[PDB]
Design a protein around this nucleic acid. Structure first.
Lengths: 113, 113
DNA sequence: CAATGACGCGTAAG
DNA sequence: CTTACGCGTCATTG
């Protein structure tokens, strides 16, 4: 049962769309920035192909590299509009649309143990 | 035997004090910042112990966290005087004396912002 | 050129 | 306490 959950990493509240069931995509609560590494990962790209596209394409624009600390939070972060376009271009939007069409009130529930 | 060596990791020149002979403490050449994680490892502290010390004490001052890259370079980096203070507070300055007292000659770098 | 396992850090969760 | 996580270098391979 895929769904959007609340989580906090290094004091940073995020929305975590769980699906797969072990796959996930994170969106920040404060600025709605999304993890582009998660998106490319959902598109089926392996590690070298991901490092390639991130270096060559994604990081040519406004972005934030996160190299610490918790693994699942790490990656390259970009504005939501940039992440949505990246998902559409890699034909992965249908698997990812809940995290893009999410408009929160208070507040998303905690994840599973 | 145990002594000071000069290495380069990810294009970053450091001074490295080796002893054990597998233990080490790195001091950066460009700003004399020292690896606080190496220091606490030189003391008897294991992972959760130094995790608490780094988070509750060391991180509350001027610091830089490094994850990824060459493994042994990783850790929490702090200015040299803060490193000397930390080494004293945790009763390990004497064993690590050469990495604090080493001097190439002319001349030490100023306090970074 | 590209791939990939080792490394080991800061974090999180059991 | 224990494990799990993913990253970016380095050495090594094809």
């Amino acid at each position: 049962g895929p769904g959007i959950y609340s989580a906090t990493y290094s004091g940073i509240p995020v929305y975590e769309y769980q699906f797969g069931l072990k796959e996930h995509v994170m969106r920040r609560r404060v600025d709605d920035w999304i993890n582009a590494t998660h998106i490319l990962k959902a598109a089926g790209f392996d590690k070298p192909a991901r490092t390639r596209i991130l270096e060559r394409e994604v990081q040519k624009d406004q972005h934030e590299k996160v190299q610490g600390g918790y693994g699942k939070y790490q990656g390259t972060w970009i504005p939501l509009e940039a992440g949505e376009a990246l998902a559409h271009r890699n034909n992965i939007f249908d698997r990812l649309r809940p995290i893009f069409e999410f408009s929160p009130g208070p507040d998303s529930p905690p994840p599973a143990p």
